[PDB]
Structure formats: structure tokens, C-alpha cells
Short mmCIF file of C-alpha atoms and ligand atoms in Angstrom, two decimals:
data_model
loop_
_atom_site.label_atom_id
_atom_site.label_comp_id
_atom_site.label_asym_id
_atom_site.label_seq_id
_atom_site.Cartn_x
_atom_site.Cartn_y
_atom_site.Cartn_z
CA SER A 12 -4.33 3.02 19.45
CA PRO A 13 -1.82 1.78 16.80
CA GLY A 14 -4.38 -1.05 16.26
CA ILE A 15 -7.67 0.94 15.75
CA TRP A 16 -9.37 1.02 12.36
CA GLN A 17 -12.67 2.57 11.24
CA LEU A 18 -14.76 1.14 8.43
CA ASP A 19 -16.39 3.62 6.05
CA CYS A 20 -18.72 2.85 3.18
CA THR A 21 -19.41 5.46 0.43
CA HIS A 22 -21.15 5.49 -3.02
CA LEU A 23 -20.19 6.44 -6.52
CA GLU A 24 -21.48 5.40 -9.98
CA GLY A 25 -24.11 3.24 -8.20
CA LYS A 26 -21.32 1.15 -6.75
CA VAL A 27 -20.09 0.85 -3.22
CA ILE A 28 -16.60 1.82 -2.03
CA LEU A 29 -15.72 0.10 1.21
CA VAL A 30 -12.83 1.90 3.08
CA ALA A 31 -10.85 1.07 6.22
CA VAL A 32 -9.09 4.05 7.87
CA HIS A 33 -6.20 3.72 10.30
CA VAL A 34 -7.54 6.32 12.73
CA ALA A 35 -4.18 7.38 14.17
CA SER A 36 -2.53 8.01 10.77
CA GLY A 37 -5.22 8.63 8.19
CA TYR A 38 -3.82 5.71 6.04
CA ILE A 39 -6.53 3.83 4.09
CA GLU A 40 -7.27 0.61 2.29
CA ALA A 41 -10.37 0.58 -0.04
CA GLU A 42 -12.20 -1.72 -2.48
CA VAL A 43 -15.14 -1.51 -4.91
CA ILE A 44 -17.92 -4.05 -4.23
CA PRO A 45 -21.34 -4.38 -5.87
CA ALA A 46 -23.15 -3.98 -2.50
CA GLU A 47 -22.14 -3.83 1.18
CA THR A 48 -22.99 -7.27 2.51
CA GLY A 49 -21.76 -9.03 5.69
CA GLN A 50 -19.79 -11.38 3.43
CA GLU A 51 -17.95 -8.58 1.59
CA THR A 52 -17.26 -6.76 4.81
CA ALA A 53 -15.93 -9.95 6.52
CA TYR A 54 -13.73 -10.77 3.50
CA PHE A 55 -12.40 -7.17 3.40
CA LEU A 56 -11.50 -7.27 7.17
CA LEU A 57 -9.75 -10.64 6.73
CA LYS A 58 -7.60 -9.03 3.99
CA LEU A 59 -6.84 -5.94 6.03
CA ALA A 60 -5.90 -7.87 9.22
CA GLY A 61 -3.56 -10.16 7.22
CA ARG A 62 -1.75 -7.07 5.98
CA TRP A 63 -1.73 -4.76 9.11
CA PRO A 64 -2.00 -5.50 12.83
CA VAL A 65 -5.73 -4.82 13.25
CA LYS A 66 -6.64 -4.88 16.99
CA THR A 67 -9.95 -3.02 16.94
CA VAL A 68 -12.44 -2.20 14.18
CA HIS A 69 -15.17 0.40 14.44
CA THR A 70 -17.73 -0.98 12.08
CA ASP A 71 -19.48 1.44 9.74
CA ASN A 72 -23.11 0.53 10.62
CA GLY A 73 -25.31 -1.65 12.70
CA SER A 74 -25.79 -4.35 10.05
CA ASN A 75 -22.13 -5.03 9.78
CA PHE A 76 -22.01 -4.78 13.57
CA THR A 77 -24.66 -7.51 13.75
CA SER A 78 -23.59 -9.66 10.85
CA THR A 79 -22.61 -13.23 11.84
CA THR A 80 -20.07 -13.39 9.00
CA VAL A 81 -18.49 -10.16 10.15
CA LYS A 82 -18.30 -11.57 13.71
CA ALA A 83 -16.83 -14.80 12.36
CA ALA A 84 -14.15 -12.90 10.45
CA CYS A 85 -13.35 -10.67 13.54
CA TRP A 86 -13.12 -13.74 15.74
CA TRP A 87 -10.95 -15.54 13.15
CA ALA A 88 -8.58 -12.63 12.73
CA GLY A 89 -8.44 -11.69 16.43
CA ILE A 90 -10.23 -8.35 15.94
CA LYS A 91 -12.14 -6.60 18.71
CA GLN A 92 -15.31 -5.57 16.88
CA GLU A 93 -16.81 -2.24 18.11
CA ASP A 94 -19.58 0.08 17.04
CA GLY A 95 -18.49 3.19 15.13
CA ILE A 96 -20.58 5.72 17.13
CA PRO A 97 -19.04 9.20 16.98
CA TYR A 98 -18.74 9.68 20.77
CA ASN A 99 -16.46 12.38 19.40
CA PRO A 100 -18.76 14.25 16.90
CA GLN A 101 -15.79 15.57 14.81
CA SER A 102 -15.65 11.89 13.68
CA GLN A 103 -18.62 12.17 11.29
CA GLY A 104 -17.02 15.35 9.74
CA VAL A 105 -13.54 13.86 9.36
CA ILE A 106 -15.03 10.79 7.53
CA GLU A 107 -17.39 12.93 5.41
CA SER A 108 -14.35 14.99 4.47
CA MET A 109 -12.34 11.92 3.52
CA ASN A 110 -15.16 10.65 1.35
CA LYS A 111 -15.23 13.98 -0.50
CA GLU A 112 -11.39 14.03 -0.84
CA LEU A 113 -11.48 10.48 -2.23
CA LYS A 114 -14.27 11.24 -4.66
CA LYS A 115 -12.37 14.33 -5.83
CA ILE A 116 -9.22 12.19 -6.48
CA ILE A 117 -11.30 9.53 -8.10
CA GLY A 118 -12.72 12.30 -10.41
CA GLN A 119 -9.25 13.63 -11.20
CA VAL A 120 -8.01 10.19 -12.34
CA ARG A 121 -11.42 9.11 -13.66
CA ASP A 122 -10.15 9.37 -17.24
CA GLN A 123 -6.99 7.24 -16.88
CA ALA A 124 -8.86 4.02 -16.18
CA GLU A 125 -11.70 2.19 -17.78
CA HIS A 126 -13.01 0.72 -14.48
CA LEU A 127 -14.05 2.31 -11.24
CA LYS A 128 -11.90 -0.09 -9.19
CA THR A 129 -8.71 1.06 -10.92
CA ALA A 130 -9.64 4.71 -10.18
CA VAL A 131 -10.27 3.82 -6.52
CA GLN A 132 -6.85 2.14 -6.16
CA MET A 133 -5.20 5.16 -7.82
CA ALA A 134 -7.02 7.31 -5.30
CA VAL A 135 -5.75 5.03 -2.41
CA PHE A 136 -2.26 5.40 -3.80
CA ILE A 137 -2.53 9.23 -3.91
CA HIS A 138 -4.14 9.63 -0.46
CA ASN A 139 -1.57 7.37 1.19
CA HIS A 140 1.42 9.12 -0.46
CA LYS A 141 0.16 12.71 -0.07
CA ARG A 142 2.58 14.79 2.07
CA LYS A 143 0.82 16.46 5.18
CA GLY A 147 6.66 16.48 8.36
CA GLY A 148 5.10 16.93 5.97
CA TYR A 149 4.94 13.12 6.47
CA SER A 150 2.34 11.16 4.43
CA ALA A 151 -0.35 8.83 5.93
CA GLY A 152 1.78 5.89 4.75
CA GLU A 153 4.83 7.16 6.68
CA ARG A 154 2.71 7.87 9.80
CA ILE A 155 1.20 4.39 9.99
CA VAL A 156 4.63 2.78 9.72
CA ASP A 157 6.09 5.26 12.32
CA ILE A 158 3.16 4.64 14.68
CA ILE A 159 3.35 0.86 14.48
CA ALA A 160 7.20 0.68 14.59
CA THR A 161 7.23 2.90 17.73
CA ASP A 162 4.67 0.52 19.19
CA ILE A 163 6.79 -2.61 18.47
CA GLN A 164 9.74 -1.10 20.41
CA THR A 165 7.98 -1.02 23.85
CA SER B 11 18.03 -0.32 -1.46
CA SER B 12 16.23 -3.28 0.21
CA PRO B 13 13.17 -1.55 1.86
CA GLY B 14 11.49 -0.96 -1.55
CA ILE B 15 12.13 -4.26 -3.35
CA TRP B 16 9.36 -6.74 -4.02
CA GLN B 17 9.21 -10.04 -5.94
CA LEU B 18 6.19 -11.23 -7.88
CA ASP B 19 5.48 -14.91 -7.60
CA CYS B 20 2.66 -16.77 -9.36
CA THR B 21 1.64 -20.28 -8.23
CA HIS B 22 -1.30 -22.64 -8.95
CA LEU B 23 -3.85 -24.46 -6.85
CA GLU B 24 -7.32 -25.97 -7.68
CA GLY B 25 -6.99 -24.85 -11.32
CA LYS B 26 -6.74 -21.25 -10.20
CA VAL B 27 -3.79 -18.86 -10.04
CA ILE B 28 -2.44 -17.34 -6.78
CA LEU B 29 -0.58 -14.09 -7.38
CA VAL B 30 1.90 -13.27 -4.56
CA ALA B 31 4.11 -10.22 -3.89
CA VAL B 32 6.90 -10.79 -1.38
CA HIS B 33 8.78 -8.01 0.37
CA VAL B 34 12.21 -9.51 -0.18
CA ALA B 35 13.95 -8.11 2.89
CA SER B 36 11.20 -9.18 5.36
CA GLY B 37 9.34 -12.17 3.82
CA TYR B 38 6.04 -10.22 4.19
CA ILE B 39 3.48 -11.05 1.49
CA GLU B 40 0.33 -9.82 -0.22
CA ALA B 41 -1.60 -12.31 -2.43
CA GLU B 42 -4.76 -12.65 -4.50
CA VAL B 43 -6.58 -15.44 -6.36
CA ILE B 44 -7.12 -14.66 -10.08
CA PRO B 45 -8.75 -16.71 -12.88
CA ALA B 46 -5.51 -16.37 -14.90
CA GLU B 47 -2.28 -14.36 -14.83
CA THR B 48 -2.77 -11.66 -17.41
CA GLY B 49 -0.97 -8.32 -17.81
CA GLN B 50 -4.11 -6.56 -16.66
CA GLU B 51 -4.41 -8.61 -13.43
CA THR B 52 -0.71 -8.18 -12.72
CA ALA B 53 -0.98 -4.39 -13.34
CA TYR B 54 -4.04 -3.98 -11.16
CA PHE B 55 -2.43 -6.08 -8.36
CA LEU B 56 0.77 -3.89 -8.54
CA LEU B 57 -1.25 -0.71 -8.37
CA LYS B 58 -2.95 -2.07 -5.21
CA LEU B 59 0.36 -3.08 -3.65
CA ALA B 60 2.13 0.27 -4.34
CA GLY B 61 -0.81 2.24 -2.90
CA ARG B 62 -0.42 0.29 0.34
CA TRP B 63 3.43 -0.01 0.76
CA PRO B 64 6.34 2.04 -0.69
CA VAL B 65 7.15 -0.11 -3.73
CA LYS B 66 10.40 1.08 -5.39
CA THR B 67 11.33 -2.02 -7.35
CA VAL B 68 9.42 -5.01 -8.61
CA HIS B 69 11.01 -8.16 -9.92
CA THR B 70 8.42 -9.50 -12.28
CA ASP B 71 7.79 -13.26 -12.08
CA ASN B 72 8.12 -13.98 -15.85
CA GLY B 73 8.89 -12.36 -19.17
CA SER B 74 5.25 -11.91 -20.20
CA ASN B 75 4.49 -9.60 -17.29
CA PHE B 76 7.95 -8.12 -17.87
CA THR B 77 6.99 -7.27 -21.41
CA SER B 78 3.31 -6.50 -20.90
CA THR B 79 2.48 -2.84 -21.75
CA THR B 80 -0.31 -2.80 -19.13
CA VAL B 81 2.19 -3.86 -16.49
CA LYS B 82 4.63 -1.17 -17.79
CA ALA B 83 1.80 1.41 -17.61
CA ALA B 84 1.01 0.49 -13.96
CA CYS B 85 4.75 0.54 -12.99
CA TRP B 86 5.10 3.92 -14.60
CA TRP B 87 1.95 5.27 -12.92
CA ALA B 88 2.95 4.03 -9.51
CA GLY B 89 6.64 5.10 -9.83
CA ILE B 90 7.87 1.49 -9.72
CA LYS B 91 11.18 0.39 -11.30
CA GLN B 92 10.13 -2.74 -13.16
CA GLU B 93 12.99 -5.26 -13.19
CA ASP B 94 13.34 -8.84 -14.31
CA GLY B 95 13.19 -11.67 -11.81
CA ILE B 96 16.32 -13.54 -12.89
CA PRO B 97 17.73 -15.45 -9.92
CA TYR B 98 21.26 -14.08 -10.42
CA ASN B 99 21.44 -15.34 -6.85
CA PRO B 100 20.17 -18.99 -7.23
CA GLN B 101 19.14 -19.09 -3.55
CA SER B 102 16.11 -17.20 -4.92
CA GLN B 103 14.26 -19.88 -6.95
CA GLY B 104 14.59 -22.10 -3.84
CA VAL B 105 13.25 -19.52 -1.36
CA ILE B 106 10.25 -18.82 -3.64
CA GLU B 107 9.58 -22.58 -4.12
CA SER B 108 9.59 -23.11 -0.33
CA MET B 109 7.19 -20.26 0.21
CA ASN B 110 4.74 -21.60 -2.37
CA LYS B 111 4.77 -24.97 -0.48
CA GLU B 112 4.41 -23.23 2.93
CA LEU B 113 1.46 -21.29 1.46
CA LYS B 114 -0.21 -24.35 -0.03
CA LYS B 115 0.30 -26.23 3.21
CA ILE B 116 -1.38 -23.32 5.11
CA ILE B 117 -4.12 -23.13 2.54
CA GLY B 118 -4.67 -26.87 3.06
CA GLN B 119 -4.91 -26.55 6.85
CA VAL B 120 -7.67 -23.82 6.63
CA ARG B 121 -9.35 -25.06 3.47
CA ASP B 122 -12.15 -26.58 5.53
CA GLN B 123 -13.06 -23.26 7.23
CA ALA B 124 -14.05 -21.43 4.04
CA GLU B 125 -16.16 -22.19 1.05
CA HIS B 126 -13.90 -20.26 -1.36
CA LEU B 127 -10.24 -20.44 -2.27
CA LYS B 128 -9.90 -16.62 -2.12
CA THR B 129 -10.81 -16.79 1.63
CA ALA B 130 -8.41 -19.64 2.33
CA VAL B 131 -5.65 -17.69 0.51
CA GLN B 132 -6.18 -14.55 2.65
CA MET B 133 -6.21 -16.70 5.83
CA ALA B 134 -2.84 -18.02 4.65
CA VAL B 135 -1.55 -14.52 4.06
CA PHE B 136 -2.71 -13.66 7.60
CA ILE B 137 -1.00 -16.76 9.09
CA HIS B 138 2.32 -16.22 7.11
CA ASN B 139 2.59 -12.55 8.02
CA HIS B 140 1.93 -13.06 11.69
CA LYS B 141 4.05 -16.24 12.19
CA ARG B 142 6.81 -15.73 14.75
CA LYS B 143 10.28 -16.75 13.47
CA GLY B 148 11.07 -14.21 17.48
CA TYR B 149 9.98 -11.43 15.03
CA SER B 150 7.22 -11.85 12.39
CA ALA B 151 7.30 -10.88 8.66
CA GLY B 152 4.76 -8.15 9.45
CA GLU B 153 7.01 -6.87 12.26
CA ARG B 154 10.07 -6.95 10.01
CA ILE B 155 8.62 -4.96 7.14
CA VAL B 156 7.41 -2.15 9.46
CA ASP B 157 10.82 -2.01 11.19
CA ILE B 158 12.64 -2.09 7.83
CA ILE B 159 10.60 0.78 6.42
CA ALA B 160 10.56 2.76 9.70
CA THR B 161 14.39 2.54 9.92
CA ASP B 162 14.52 3.75 6.38
CA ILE B 163 12.33 6.83 6.94
CA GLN B 164 14.17 7.89 10.17
O1 ZT2 C 1 -4.79 2.40 -18.73
C1 ZT2 C 1 -4.32 2.27 -17.59
C2 ZT2 C 1 -3.27 3.11 -16.97
C3 ZT2 C 1 -3.11 2.41 -15.63
C4 ZT2 C 1 -2.21 2.80 -14.66
C5 ZT2 C 1 -2.17 2.06 -13.49
C6 ZT2 C 1 -3.01 0.96 -13.34
C7 ZT2 C 1 -3.90 0.57 -14.32
C8 ZT2 C 1 -3.93 1.32 -15.46
C9 ZT2 C 1 -4.74 1.20 -16.67
C10 ZT2 C 1 -5.71 0.33 -17.01
C11 ZT2 C 1 -6.23 -0.83 -16.24
C12 ZT2 C 1 -5.27 -1.81 -15.92
C13 ZT2 C 1 -5.59 -2.96 -15.21
C14 ZT2 C 1 -6.88 -3.12 -14.85
C15 ZT2 C 1 -7.85 -2.20 -15.14
C16 ZT2 C 1 -7.55 -1.03 -15.84
C17 ZT2 C 1 -8.65 -0.09 -16.11
O2 ZT2 C 1 -8.68 0.52 -17.22
O3 ZT2 C 1 -9.52 0.05 -15.25
O4 ZT2 C 1 -9.10 -2.59 -14.64
C18 ZT2 C 1 -8.73 -3.75 -13.87
O5 ZT2 C 1 -7.37 -4.17 -14.15
O1 ZT2 C 2 6.69 4.31 4.51
C1 ZT2 C 2 5.65 4.25 3.86
C2 ZT2 C 2 4.48 3.31 4.05
C3 ZT2 C 2 3.61 3.66 2.90
C4 ZT2 C 2 2.42 3.03 2.57
C5 ZT2 C 2 1.74 3.45 1.45
C6 ZT2 C 2 2.24 4.50 0.69
C7 ZT2 C 2 3.42 5.11 1.02
C8 ZT2 C 2 4.10 4.68 2.12
C9 ZT2 C 2 5.36 5.14 2.75
C10 ZT2 C 2 6.23 6.16 2.55
C11 ZT2 C 2 6.11 7.22 1.56
C12 ZT2 C 2 4.89 7.90 1.56
C13 ZT2 C 2 4.69 8.94 0.67
C14 ZT2 C 2 5.66 9.29 -0.21
C15 ZT2 C 2 6.87 8.61 -0.20
C16 ZT2 C 2 7.10 7.60 0.69
C17 ZT2 C 2 8.41 6.92 0.73
O2 ZT2 C 2 8.76 6.16 -0.22
O3 ZT2 C 2 9.06 7.23 1.78
O4 ZT2 C 2 7.71 9.12 -1.18
C18 ZT2 C 2 6.73 9.83 -1.98
O5 ZT2 C 2 5.59 10.28 -1.16
O1 ZT2 C 3 -17.14 -19.26 7.27
C1 ZT2 C 3 -16.20 -18.48 7.35
C2 ZT2 C 3 -15.19 -18.38 8.43
C3 ZT2 C 3 -14.42 -17.17 8.02
C4 ZT2 C 3 -13.40 -16.61 8.77
C5 ZT2 C 3 -12.81 -15.48 8.24
C6 ZT2 C 3 -13.24 -14.92 7.01
C7 ZT2 C 3 -14.25 -15.50 6.30
C8 ZT2 C 3 -14.82 -16.64 6.83
C9 ZT2 C 3 -15.91 -17.44 6.33
C10 ZT2 C 3 -16.67 -17.43 5.21
C11 ZT2 C 3 -16.55 -16.44 4.11
C12 ZT2 C 3 -16.77 -15.11 4.42
C13 ZT2 C 3 -16.69 -14.12 3.44
C14 ZT2 C 3 -16.35 -14.52 2.17
C15 ZT2 C 3 -16.12 -15.83 1.85
C16 ZT2 C 3 -16.22 -16.84 2.79
C17 ZT2 C 3 -15.98 -18.24 2.43
O2 ZT2 C 3 -16.69 -19.12 2.99
O3 ZT2 C 3 -15.08 -18.48 1.58
O4 ZT2 C 3 -15.81 -16.00 0.50
C18 ZT2 C 3 -15.78 -14.60 0.07
O5 ZT2 C 3 -16.22 -13.70 1.12
O1 ZT2 C 4 3.70 -4.75 13.31
C1 ZT2 C 4 3.15 -5.47 12.47
C2 ZT2 C 4 2.91 -5.20 11.02
C3 ZT2 C 4 2.12 -6.35 10.59
C4 ZT2 C 4 1.60 -6.55 9.34
C5 ZT2 C 4 0.86 -7.70 9.10
C6 ZT2 C 4 0.67 -8.61 10.11
C7 ZT2 C 4 1.19 -8.41 11.34
C8 ZT2 C 4 1.92 -7.27 11.58
C9 ZT2 C 4 2.57 -6.78 12.74
C10 ZT2 C 4 2.84 -7.23 13.99
C11 ZT2 C 4 2.50 -8.55 14.57
C12 ZT2 C 4 2.96 -9.63 13.87
C13 ZT2 C 4 2.71 -10.92 14.35
C14 ZT2 C 4 2.05 -11.05 15.55
C15 ZT2 C 4 1.60 -9.96 16.24
C16 ZT2 C 4 1.82 -8.68 15.78
C17 ZT2 C 4 1.37 -7.56 16.58
O2 ZT2 C 4 0.13 -7.50 16.82
O3 ZT2 C 4 2.26 -6.73 16.95
O4 ZT2 C 4 0.94 -10.33 17.41
C18 ZT2 C 4 0.76 -11.74 17.10
O5 ZT2 C 4 1.73 -12.25 16.12
#
């Protein structure tokens, strides 16, 4: 469970925002891409798994589930690729809520940056630092993974 | 003071620039390929970093990025103390130089498995961070920051 991530893809300004959520903590990484292809998704997972211990990924849709490039990246990085089917239905709502939160932050900083990608990274910054402890998502992920290392 | 300190490091390969941030206390890195090191690239890269780890201090890699107003804007935004990168401890220039070689060596060993340099560079970041030294850099940074919170 310290190793489970969920991929999430949302839209804004006719661009695509790919998001990985660390399910246990709510911590995210996100990027702007021109379209969600297998190649983007695979490259994004390679980045994530080099930066956090990614054991399992719940892919956002069936195309990325099926994608050969995605499977190659998952194999390369040691990731157990899974579907992202909400066998707990509160899953669709939690994600939908995140997407709305993120878009609201992106809107609040909209003005401080010329490009959408800068706004998105500002929104990642704010989401990850936001106090619940009240511990933030960033503190939780570190706490979860550190606990896990000492066992 | 050590859990928040990062060092910027810029190196070259295949006519492109590899921008690296090293968590000084753990050796853990993030890195990107850019067409050229500009203030804007450096500022955007720092914004990314500080959204993903608690970045308190950055030692910039050179005086241009030290001076750059875009880099100062991103440091301000993200709450980062921008410092110089003067190796007051000389054991620094040597540690950074070794890393760059280690990275290029890893990039060379994977270079065949990916069409693009960016992919090879992220493979290298993956290999460096996971390498057992037997704790890894990725293990160390989590333990350093966890200890700090608690
Ligand atoms: O003006 C500000 C304040 C600020 C605070 C934090 C980060 C960036 C910026 C910033 C501009 C900017 C800078 C670099 C970029 C970039 C943009 C942008 O305007 O989108 O796009 C890609 O690299
Ligand atoms: O530990 C981590 C991992 C991480 C990853 C990304 C962002 C923050 C953090 C983080 C901690 C943290 C969190 C929120 C904060 C904050 C701190 C902090 O510096 O302790 O101070 C302001 O709001
Ligand atoms: O073939 C493989 C094996 C592999 C293992 C891990 C990650 C990528 C790849 C990969 C290809 C690839 C995929 C996406 C990319 C990308 C490349 C590339 O070939 O550089 O460049 C940008 O997005
Ligand atoms: O805890 C962290 C943070 C982190 C950030 C980035 C990469 C790895 C890790 C990491 C741990 C880890 C490290 C090396 C390994 C390894 C593990 C692991 O999965 O625990 O298993 C194989 O070599």
C-alpha cells in the first residue's frame, strides 16, 4: 500500500493534464501534455518511478492499460500495472473531486504564469503542501514510506 | 538544516544540457534534459522540484541562474532560499564531477534501450536513486525528511 499509485487524466484549455496520485497520502505529481498517448504515459511513469518507489499503478483507462509502450515502461521500472476500476465506487468521486480542486487552484494562479504548465506545477506545489495533523500530502507520503522502510 | 538543501548541477551530453538537482544530504537526484540552460528553464525546474520535495535552500550552479530574475521569482514563489554554489568545502566540486560521470556512464549503458536522450536520462535517474550503497539515495532522503518531521 505504500507503493500504490493511480493515474488520472483531466482536461483544461484543450490540453491534457496527466496526474499520478499516491493513493495512501493524496500526494500528486502532474504534467501538461498535448494529448494522452501511450508514449507520454510511459515516459511519465518512468519519471515517477525514478523519483518514488512505485510498486503498483492503476492506469487511468483501457488504452493505457493496453499500450505496449506503457507495458514496456512498467516492466522496465518494475511496476505492477493494474486496471483502475473503482471496485470501491468512492474512487470515481475522490478523483473527480481532486480534478475540481486542481482546476480551482490552477484558476487561482492562472494569472501569475504565462503558460498552463507553470500553473499546473504551482497547483502541484499548493496541493502537496496544503495542511489537512494537520499534516500535508507531502508529509504523509514521506511518513508512509519511511514507516514502511523500518519493517 | 540539511533535510532542505539542494544543489543545482548542469552537465552536457550529445549537444544537449542535463539539469540535475541533488539532495545534498542523501545523494538523491531529479534531472531533466533541456535545449539550453536559461533562467526560465531553471525557474520552471525549481518550481517542479519544490512542489515534489520540501526545498528550503538551493545552491545555484552558476552566477547567471544566481542572478536571473526569473529564477529569483520562482525561488520567492516556492519559498526557497536561493544561495550561491561556491564550494567553500572543495570536496563539493569533486563530488559533483563524480556524479556527472556516474550519470553519463549510466546514460551510456541504457542509451540503446531508448530512442531519446530524455528517456535515457530518466532511466539514469531511476538507476541512481535505487542503487544500494546497504541503503539507497531514495531510502535516505525519505528517512532524512521523516526524521525531520517527527
Ligand atoms: O512570472 C512568473 C512567476 C513564477 C513563479 C514561479 C515559477 C514561474 C514563474 C513565472 C514565469 C514562468 C517561468 C518559467 C517558465 C514559465 C513561466 C510562465 O510564465 O509560464 O513557463 C515555462 O518556464
Ligand atoms: O516532508 C515533505 C515531503 C513533501 C513533498 C512535497 C511538498 C511538501 C513536502 C513535505 C513537507 C511539508 C509539507 C507541507 C508544508 C511544509 C512541509 C515541510 O517543509 O515540512 O511546510 C509548509 O507546508
Ligand atoms: O522503448 C522503450 C523502452 C522504454 C522503457 C522505459 C521507458 C520508455 C521506454 C521506451 C521508449 C520510449 C517511451 C516513451 C518515450 C520515449 C521513448 C524513447 O524511445 O526514448 O521518448 C519519450 O517518451
Ligand atoms: O523509499 C524510497 C524512496 C525512493 C525514491 C526513489 C527511488 C527509490 C526510493 C525508495 C526505496 C527503494 C530504493 C531502492 C530500492 C528499493 C526501494 C524500495 O522499493 O523500498 O527496492 C529496490 O532498490
